[PDB]
Paper text:
Here, we report the discovery of potent boron-based compounds that inhibit an unprecedented target of Wolbachia, [name] ([name]), and demonstrate that inhibition of this microbiota target is an efficient approach to arrest the growth of its host. The editing site of [name] plays a key role to maintain fidelity in protein translation by hydrolyzing tRNALeu mischarged to noncognate amino acids such as norvaline.
To unveil the structural details of the inhibition mechanism of Wolbachia [name] by these compounds, we performed crystallization trials with the protein in the presence and absence of inhibitors and AMP. In addition, the region 313 to 318, which, as judged by the high crystallographic B factors, is highly flexible in the apo-structure, becomes more compact in the complex and makes interactions to the adduct. The new high-resolution crystal structures presented reveal idiosyncratic features at the drug binding pocket, which rationalize the selectivity of these Wolbachia inhibitors.
Residue numbers in the entry: 221 to 266, 271 to 277, 287 to 394
Write the structure that this text describes.
Amino acid sequence: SEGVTIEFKIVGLNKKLKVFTTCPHTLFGASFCAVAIEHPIVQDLMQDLISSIVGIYTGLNVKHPFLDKELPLYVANFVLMEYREGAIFGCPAHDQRDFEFAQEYDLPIIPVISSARLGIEEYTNNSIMFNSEFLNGLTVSEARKVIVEKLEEKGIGKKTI
């Protein structure tokens, strides 16, 4: 559904990777990036392990837009190309798809969503973000609103439904 496209700088090549996500507030808990096999970046400047033969590390990282931190870029068979761009960032702590990836390839787990008691959680007092620098202390809905403004003001991302 409605989401946002984020432009990641790749340390390896001149082309920048553009991922689509429905949960931009979890960007600070990102452990890695990953693309499908049929992605332009794969065939452009990179194959024996990919074509013949879970995911494979490209050898290059991507610069995290809001942290002095690099994330490993992967090419996995589980990644779906059809849905939008076919490129995503993995949040192990709040996604079982991304966790099983991080568990196998020893990628770090960073939780960023402090969940509240269930009776009060979803009604109004949405879970509190943390480990997210400026997003700390505010709710998920407020985090998703603010983080999009940071992406748009700095030319990093734009709204896409």
